[PDB]
């Protein structure tokens, strides 16, 4: 009686979903991942007369998200999909990673747009003499992607964050005790054409994203950062992993717990563009330390 | 340059506070622990014309908290301190635990009151017949209601509980991992309590290691008090998470707690025969009180 046949077709299985206790072959795993992503996005995102910008970085996540989104919008006529790669401009890596994303876009017919850090910002790599490097990079990338999505007049900005990436970030915000970082995430419903950040992979674990990348034979590139290595996220990932390894569905209950939390919690800027308040811009804080550069509003 | 002299007096040290990177001798550590507890309680708790009931269970925490509170209220003329021991009646050796707590109350002159679970309707002489849920949860929930009803009976202003920084960081993390917002809703709302006696935790910001070190220096005769009918492995797993986080990032337990304190201040704000209620449906928090036990007027 206790075998390993597929839950949907009773055929030999390739994946045992440790959370649910369900076995899935190649075909049934792809179908249930597509179903879960279709559920995550909803009918507001998956419909006609919709333009979706997507932040691609060459890794498994971006390419897996890019492939799934393309499969849906391929069978929708007036529903465009644009790919944005943001070249940080490092002497070490970054050059490799975007190459795998560009070659994917060519092979699958996705309109790509490579935008550089050394364009919107004057300095390509490091503001050496003081201030956090990995954070600075992520904050700017978000503002660049928002500005490119507005420029291309996109309805949504798709980001390849998986359930592990979200569970880690939630747990990090919990361990750090950040309520100010939790506050900025609060006002993210619908704002002045401020392109809505969608995460199609938000409920798919890293292992499933990786397994889906292997089965689709997607030529993804890891691209390790030569100027940033935060050991806290790798420590937090081990916490969430060991929690999942002892209690299946921990990562989901951690995330669902933050989703419920964010519901029950209660353009302003200078020169550039609105994000929260005028005061002294959080992005232009590092800009003030050097000198303000091109690309701004009226 | 790099020695080990005391941060407050420059004398050889007995404790290295791994989170602050500071060193304290016996006298300076006792003084900084007393200062932190004085800070946790405030002027409203540490003043004249108040009575403080305190849940004692015989362990280092309850005795350390009982000793500190007694030191303060000893010099305060019009302020009282009552100790309440709750024998759950769940057989085994709970008696040896209360024995250490009673013998402290005798040696230090604190008015003690031993109250039973069986005395407040039911039995619980191992009642679960064939902290998270079912046996361990039901015990903790009742204990709270018994302690509240003994404090009301003695007309106390506050109910002191021996929860330490480790105890508090773990519970917060458990509530985070479980994703409980309904259990988070119970905390707060009832901030303007009518009949409910205010639950104070003097040890709330003192880590378990400091509480234990303070117990050793004061030569307190505390009892181990182990449970023969409850062992929840999740809290022991969570404690290891909070410990390994502290061991790699000093002050993690405090930032986890301070993060929950800041969260609870910016968050969203029928029980027949007994009472409690306060924006809650059916038995409020009373696990059952129906069929298996009943017994009502
Ligand atoms: S790891 Fe590198 S590319 Fe990623 S946010 Fe940090 S600095 Fe930027
Ligand atoms: S460990 Fe034992 S005494 Fe403590 S709450 Fe659980 S059942 Fe009650
Ligand atoms: Zn199948
Ligand atoms: Zn700005
Ligand atoms: Zn000293
Ligand atoms: Zn009741």
- SS3 of residue A5 by DSSP: strand
Could you give the C-alpha distances from B11 to B24, B216, B217, B254, in angstroms and in order? 8, 20, 17, 28
Contacts of A257 in chain B (CB under 8 A): 176-181
Three-state secondary-structure class, residue B291 = coil
Distance separating alpha carbons of residues A127 and B149, to the nearest angstrom: 63
* C-alpha to C-alpha distance for A137 and A121, rounded to whole angstroms: 11
CB of residue B227 inside a 6 A radius of ligand 2: yes
Residue A215 CA from chain centroid, whole number: 21
Neighbours of B227 (CB within 10 A): 15
Sign of CA dihedral B239, B242, B244, B247: negative
For residue A94, the ligand 1 atom closest to its alpha carbon is 3
Residues B25 and B7: their CA atoms lie apart, in Å, by 9
Alpha carbon distance B105, B83 (integer Å): 8
Compute the distance between CA of residue A69 and CA of residue A41 in angstroms, rounded to an integer.
Answer: 10
Whether the CB-CB separation of A230 and A132 falls below 8 Å is answered with no
Ligand 1 site, CB within 6 A: A 88, 133-134, 137-138, 225, 227-228
Q: Is A212 exposed, middle or buried (0-12, 13-18, 19+ CB in 10 A)?
A: buried
Technique used: X-ray
Q: Cα–Cα distance between B104 and B220 in angstroms, integer?
A: 8
Q: What is the DSSP letter of B235?
A: H
- For residue B255, the surrounding DSSP H or E stretch is helix B252-264
Reported in sequence order, the residue ranges of chain B that DSSP labels E, i.e. its strands, are 15-17, 22-24, 51-55, 80-87, 111-116, 158-161, 198-200
Q: Are B72 and B28 in contact (CB under 8 A)?
A: no
Query: Are the C-beta atoms of B229 and B134 separated by less than 8 Å?
Result: no
Question: Among residues A187, A214, A224, which one has the least CA distance to residue A88?
Answer: A224
Asked if A8 and A17 count as a contact pair (C-beta separation under 8 A), the reply is no
DSSP-assigned letter for residue B127:
-
The strands making up A81-87's β-sheet, listed across from edge to edge, are A111-116, A81-87, A52-55, A156-159, A196-198
Atom of ligand 2 nearest to the CA of B88: 3
Whether the CB-CB separation of B252 and B246 falls below 8 Å is answered with yes
Counting other chains too, the contacts that B45-51 makes at CB distance below 8 Å and 24 or more residues apart are B45/B158, B45/B200, B46/B72, B46/B76, B47/B76, B47/B79, B48/B76, B48/B77, B48/B78, B48/B79, B49/B78, B49/B79, B50/B79, B50/B80, B50/B157, B50/B158, B51/B79, B51/B80, B51/B81, B51/B82, B51/B154, B51/B155, B51/B156, B51/B157
CA of A138 to the centre of ligand 4 (A): 15
Instruction: Note whether A207 and A237 are within 8 A (CB).
Output: no
Q: Provide the 8-state DSSP code for A111.
A: E
- Beta strand A22-24 with A15-17: parallel, antiparallel or unpaired? antiparallel
B127 lines ligand 2 (CB under 6 A): no
Distance (Å) from the C-alpha of residue A206 to the closest C-alpha of chain B? 19
H/E stretch holding B234 reads: helix B233-246
Question: How many Cβ atoms are within 10 Å of A180's Cβ, its own excluded?
Answer: 8
In degrees, rounded to 5, the angle at the alpha carbon of residue A140 between the alpha carbons of residues A86 and A45 is: 70
How buried is B278 (Cβ within 10 angstroms: 0-12 exposed, 13-18 middle, 19+ buried)? middle
Binding residues of B for Zn(2+): 6, 9, 25, 28, 271, 274, 283, 286
Torsion of CA A266, A269, A272, A273, to 10 degrees: 40
Which residues are CB-contacts of B38 (< 8 A; sequence separation ≥ 6)?
B46, B72
Which ligand gives the minimal distance to the CA of B117? 2
Other beta carbons within 10 Å of B63: 26
Instruction: Answer for the pair A209, A201: CB distance below 8 angstroms, yes or no.
Output: yes
């Amino acid at each position: 009686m206790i075998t390993m046949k597929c839950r949907k077709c009773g055929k030999p299985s390739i994946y045992h979903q440790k959370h649910s206790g369900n076995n899935y072959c190649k075909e049934c795993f792809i179908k249930e991942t597509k179903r879960k992503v279709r559920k995550t996005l909803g009918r507001d995102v998956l419909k006609n007369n919709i333009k979706v910008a997507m932040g691609l970085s060459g890794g498994k996540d971006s390419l897996v998200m890019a492939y799934l989104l393309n499969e849906y919008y391929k069978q929708i006529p007036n529903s465009n999909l644009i790919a944005i790669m943001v070249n940080e401009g490092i002497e070490g890596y970054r050059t490799d990673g975007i190459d795998a994303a560009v070659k994917f876009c060519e092979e699958y017919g996705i309109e790509y747009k490579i935008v550089h850090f050394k364009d919107y910002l004057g300095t390509n790599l490091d503001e050496i003499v003081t201030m956090n490097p990995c954070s600075f990079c992520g904050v700017i990338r978000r503002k660049i992607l928002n500005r490119v999505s507005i420029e291309e007049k996109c309805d949504f900005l798709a980001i390849g964050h998986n359930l592990d990436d979200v569970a880690q970030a939630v747990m990090m915000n919990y361990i750090e005790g950040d309520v100010k970082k939790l506050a900025f995430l609060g006002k993210s419903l619908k704002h002045p054409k401020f392109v809505k950040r969608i995460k199609p992979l938000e409920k798919i674990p890293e292992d499933e994203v990786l397994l889906l990348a292997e089965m689709l034979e997607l030529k993804y590139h890891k691209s390790p950062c030569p100027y940033s290595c935060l050991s806290f996220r790798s420590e937090v990932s081990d916490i969430t992993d060991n929690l999942e390894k002892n209690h299946p569905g921990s990562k989901y209950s951690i995330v669902r717990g933050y989703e419920r939390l964010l519901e029950h919690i209660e353009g302003e800027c200078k020169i550039c563009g609105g994000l929260s308040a005028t005061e002294v811009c959080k992005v232009c804080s590092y800009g003030k330390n050097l000198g303000i550069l091109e690309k701004s509003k009226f």
